[PDB]
Design a binder for this molecule. Structure first.
Ligand code: BCL
Ligand code: BCL
Ligand code: BCL
Ligand code: BCL
Ligand code: BCL
Ligand code: BCL
Ligand code: BCL
Ligand code: BCL
Ligand code: BCL
Ligand code: HEM
Lengths: 37, 49, 315, 26, 49, 34, 49, 38, 37, 37
């Protein structure tokens, strides 16, 4: 197979974590929801 | 690769099938939770308007 | 018939041509689409601002006027062709004084006519709870005239003929001015202030002195970076980096005059023998950022010939 | 008249590319 | 390369067929979703005018 | 090579999507997120 | 791998089964405590409003 | 097998610790709870 | 066994010491207890 | 045994000395005891 399962899992998990952190931080900084004062 | 289905035999290992199944179930659960959370957040305060 | 059988006969070599063509097409398409999207959904970059008095400052939205003071304005003006009980504004009629008050005094502070002096009788002095504000305004006018006729007149005509008015320092706020705001205190210590107790023709000289050390150089650097931030032109605006002591860029003498002006403001109006007593401005020290606001010419500055001649640099 | 010329040159380029590819790919 | 069709055998492998099919289906689904989203955005707010 | 094409396509798509969302958000022409 | 169940033999060793059980029990306790703490904090001060 | 138990344990524990510290710090800096002198 | 006793002891001891130091410093710096002036 | 006597002695001595020095420095800097002026 062209790619291994290990590399796929690593890339997918890293991308998901980075995306979730970025989206929470951007939504918090937008000041559009009244979350945490 | 006794447990692996016939069509996926040249792609998967016997031990990797179980891990892949676990990952698929986790993704499905996370997707359902995310859908519910998005619906609740839209019901609270719309973001597009 | 071909000259490259290995490239035009075999499938593996025949795939590379299509691969390269697709790669070029994809790169071109992605670049074009991204730049088209970027240039289509972006607003117009630079909207110019024109105003017959101010330099990049506006007062046209006048919702702060109660609209009844304007009603009494015309009645007052019709009753009295000439001003009565005026102590500073001289050589002007009631209409001109009213225009000055509407455009300059109220435009520069964003306050109603009732803030300072009574709408019922505009000539009253101390019959209302706002006489102190009018006294402070008169002192402000005298200070502005002093600053215009003693310091701004020394600058060459190359800089222009811009004058100092209420909006130069107030910028649309009646009170609570903020010299040294937190956004301009980025790289500096949070409690740093300009050293307004020195003689600026030689106050901040460090080159080869041999009686100073790195601490004096640090203080000089703090002052210099403050001067940079108050404009937007970088460290070369007044200097040549090959030799700092040189006087050749012609905005360094202007900075000397500005520094002397700021020292005069500090020692005559902010706190003459005590900031609490005998001093207007509530004990707030002046700053370059207060007027200049990150530009070469202050946004609150007035164009030549706009201010009354009594307050002008050439009365 | 610029867009018409741009379309003309683009069509000429596409036709030439297709013709030469068909010549090679046969 | 038993599963690969005769035309594409010299270039591909058994597993690369399956991975290529997965990638093709993913691309088609993403394209349909993008088309729907673009149409919705145009209906909400045109950008050309 | 299949792997190089897949890698290039994936990175290009991700970069373009992120850049375009950032540009659209910074434009302030859609009334999205205040 | 005597103690490892039949399904999980290809992935687990006899020694790792016990450590996995310990980790699972610890995670369950942590989730229970987290739920209690979140309920207590919400009863104290709502963070959405 | 794709991954060993040791690497999974290490990654999970590190992620949990960093997330807990980050969330506590963010909540403390937000100033929205009246905790530890406001 | 995936981990040795030595590694577990070392990691636990370092984590505990660092956490205790951090918590004491945060509590002292917050100035909400009237401890040490 | 997971640890030897030498390593334990070294680590304990270093930790004790570091903690004592840190505590004296914090107490001196706090200025709440009237010690050393
Ligand atoms: C509130 C409304 C906000 C907004 C706020 C957020 C926030 C905040 C988040 C998202 C996230 C996402 N948003 Mg949203 N979002 C908005 C509008 C949109 C719009 C749109 C066009 O309007 C779109 C298309 C999306 C689309 C998306 C997805 C890309 C993504 C959720 C699905 C996913 O990928 O799950 C894939 C991910 C998973 C399946 C993860 C599953 C993880 C499991 C459940 C474990 C979690 C940790 C847990 C504690 C573990 C415990 C056990 C121990 C390990 C032992 N959003 C508006 C503006 N959105 C979420 C995300 O994850 O983005 C990457 C996210 O964090
Ligand atoms: C807009 C007006 C401009 C100008 C714009 C241009 C531009 C732009 C170009 C020229 C080009 C040329 N110009 Mg002119 N030109 C101007 C004025 C002049 C003057 C003059 C004294 O005023 C002169 C003497 C010339 C002279 C010339 C020639 C040297 C040349 C065109 C003939 C040629 O080379 O054919 C010989 C060339 C060929 C036979 C090429 C045929 C190619 C075919 C069509 C295939 C294309 C690629 C194909 C799709 C690939 C397929 C296979 C792949 C594997 C897929 N120009 C003015 C100032 N000129 C063109 C040129 O070819 O320059 C080298 C050119 O690109
Ligand atoms: C990062 C992604 C995860 C992963 C996540 C999943 C998920 C999730 C699934 C699979 C499934 C499959 N995966 Mg897996 N998989 C991974 C790694 C692998 C690897 C590998 C590394 O070697 C291989 C060989 C496979 C191979 C396979 C097959 C065994 C199986 C069927 C594929 C198929 O038919 O696709 C052909 C089909 C497609 C390409 C579908 C494409 C659909 C497109 C993308 C459109 C979807 C639109 C969506 C519904 C829109 C929602 C909009 C909102 C409602 C607003 N996966 C990694 C670790 N895999 C599936 C399965 O278990 O089936 C029983 C499955 O559900
Ligand atoms: C401005 C108006 C709209 C808006 C307009 C649009 C429009 C219009 C579109 C989107 C699209 C998308 N939008 Mg948007 N969007 C909005 C706000 C949001 C918000 C938010 C928080 O507010 C979020 C989270 C999103 C999220 C998203 C995504 C669901 C999607 C782009 C995905 C992507 O990167 O594809 C590119 C990603 C890749 C190429 C990577 C794929 C990786 C795969 C899926 C995972 C496995 C990888 C595998 C393991 C790798 C193996 C090989 C390696 C070599 C090892 N939108 C606002 C409200 N959005 C697009 C869409 O629908 O796409 C389908 C789209 O066209
Ligand atoms: C902001 C409002 C509340 C508050 C809201 C909450 C909420 C809400 C929660 C907590 C939770 C916790 N809070 Mg708090 N918290 C407050 C104030 C405090 C104060 C303080 C100084 O005032 C302290 C000390 C704490 C401390 C704590 C912890 C007890 C706990 C998080 C544990 C952790 O780090 O998990 C991070 C670590 C992991 C996820 C993994 C750890 C794995 C094991 C334990 C590692 C041990 C070492 C290992 C075995 C070494 C050997 C193996 C190696 C592999 C070699 N809180 C205030 C008053 N707090 C959480 C909780 O209850 O958790 C159960 C929680 O959900
Ligand atoms: C006060 C209300 C705050 C807030 C404050 C916090 C704080 C503070 C914390 C969380 C944490 C979490 N929050 Mg909360 N959180 C809020 C709102 C939310 C919302 C929401 C949509 O509103 C969501 C979805 C979440 C979700 C979550 C989870 C990601 C996580 C708790 C579950 C978990 O991982 O358990 C699994 C947890 C464990 C398995 C930990 C086990 C630790 C063991 C028990 C050891 C403890 C220490 C002990 C002394 C060790 C002693 C022995 C020696 C080692 C030998 N929070 C609001 C804004 N939240 C906690 C967390 O873990 O973040 C990573 C955390 O610390
Ligand atoms: C005063 C009230 C303060 C506060 C002040 C502190 C301080 C200060 C400390 C804690 C500590 C802790 N706090 Mg508290 N804490 C508060 C609020 C909270 C809240 C909350 C939700 O409000 C929570 C969940 C916690 C939770 C916790 C735990 C994580 C921990 C205590 C249990 C533990 O680890 O035991 C397990 C602990 C041990 C097994 C210690 C064993 C030590 C051995 C005996 C050696 C002792 C030293 C001795 C001199 C050795 C001598 C011989 C030489 C070695 C030769 N705190 C408030 C804000 N808390 C302590 C801690 O350890 O944090 C990591 C700590 O230092
Ligand atoms: C703030 C109010 C008080 C005060 C309050 C206290 C209190 C309260 C205490 C002390 C204690 C101590 N104070 Mg005090 N202290 C004050 C002012 C002072 C002043 C000063 C200049 O003013 C000094 C010098 C001291 C000095 C001292 C030490 C005698 C003692 C801590 C010893 C130590 O480090 O143990 C830690 C040392 C070690 C861990 C190392 C031991 C090494 C041994 C002794 C030598 C052999 C090493 C061996 C060969 C190594 C082998 C292994 C190698 C790897 C090869 N205090 C003021 C006046 N002080 C503490 C005490 O009583 O201790 C008994 C204590 O509890
Ligand atoms: C003044 C009052 C201050 C304060 C000032 C100090 C100071 C200062 C010190 C301590 C120290 C300690 N403090 Mg106290 N401390 C305060 C409040 C507290 C509180 C509390 C909850 O209020 C607690 C729990 C503690 C707890 C502690 C212990 C951790 C420790 C003392 C016991 C110990 O370690 O013995 C075990 C100690 C030993 C076994 C040391 C033995 C050393 C031998 C005797 C050699 C000494 C050196 C000598 C020069 C050798 C000479 C010969 C040559 C080798 C040839 N303090 C208040 C706020 N505390 C001391 C300490 O040691 O901290 C680490 C210390 O230095
Ligand atoms: C930019 C950060 C900057 C630097 C660096 C800098 C340096 C500098 C030095 C070293 C001196 C004194 C050297 C000497 O021996 O005389 C000095 C003096 C003055 N500078 Fe300056 N300077 C920087 C920035 C700026 C800017 C942007 C201006 C103009 C607004 C400016 C002006 C002046 C003036 C005036 C002096 C004279 C100081 C005095 O005579 O007491 N500087 N600068």
């Amino acid at each position: 197979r062209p790619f291994e399962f290990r590399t796929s899992v690593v890339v997918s998990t890293l991308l998901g974590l980075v995306m979730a952190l970025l989206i929470h931080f951007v939504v918090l900084s937008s000041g559009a929801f009244n979350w945490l004062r | 690769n006794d447990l692996v289905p016939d069509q996926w035999k040249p792609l998967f290992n016997n031990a990797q099938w179980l891990v892949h199944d676990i990952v698929v179930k986790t993704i499905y659960g996370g997707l359902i939770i995310a859908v519910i959370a998005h619906v609740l957040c839209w019901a609270w305060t719309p973001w597009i308007r | 018939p071909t000259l490259f059988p290995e490239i035009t006969n075999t499938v593996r070599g025949r795939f590379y041509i299509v691969a390269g063509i697709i790669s070029v097409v994809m790169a071109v398409a992605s670049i074009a689409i991204f730049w088209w999207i970027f240039y289509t959904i972006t607003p117009a970059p630079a909207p110019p601002l024109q105003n017959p008095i101010y330099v990049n400052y506006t007062q046209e939205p006048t919702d702060y006027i109660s609209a009844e003071s304007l009603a009494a304005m015309n009645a007052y003006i019709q009753a009295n062709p000439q001003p009565q009980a005026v102590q500073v504004l001289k050589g002007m009629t009631t209409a001109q004084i009213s225009a000055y008050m509407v455009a300059q005094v109220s435009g520069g502070l964003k306050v109603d006519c009732s803030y300072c002096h009574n709408i019922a009788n505009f000539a009253q002095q101390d019959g209302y709870p706002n006489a102190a504000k009018k006294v402070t305004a008169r002192k402000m006018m005298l200070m502005s005239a002093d600053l215009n006729q003693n310091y701004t007149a020394k600058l060459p005509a190359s800089v222009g003929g811009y004058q100092i008015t209420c909006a130069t320092c107030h910028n649309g706020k009646a009170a609570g001015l903020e010299p040294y705001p937190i956004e301009i205190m980025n790289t500096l210590p949070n409690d740093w202030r300009l050293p307004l107790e020195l003689d600026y023709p030689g106050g901040l000289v460090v080159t080869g002195r041999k009686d100073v050390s790195n601490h004096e150089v640090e203080q000089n650097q703090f002052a210099m970076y403050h001067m940079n931030v108050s404009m937007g032109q970088g460290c070369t605006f007044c200097h040549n980096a090959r030799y700092f002591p040189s006087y050749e860029i012609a905005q360094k003498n202007h900075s000397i005059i500005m520094l002397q002006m700021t020292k005069h403001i500090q020692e005559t109006y902010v706190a003459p023998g005590g900031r609490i007593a005998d001093g207007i401005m509530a004990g707030k020290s002046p700053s370059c950022w207060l007027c200049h606001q990150g530009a070469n010419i202050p946004p609150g500055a007035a164009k030549p010939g706009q201010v009354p001649a009594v307050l002008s640099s050439t009365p | 008249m610029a867009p018409f010329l741009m379309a003309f040159f683009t069509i000429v380029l596409i036709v030439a590319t297709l013709y030469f590819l068909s010549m090679i790919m046969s």
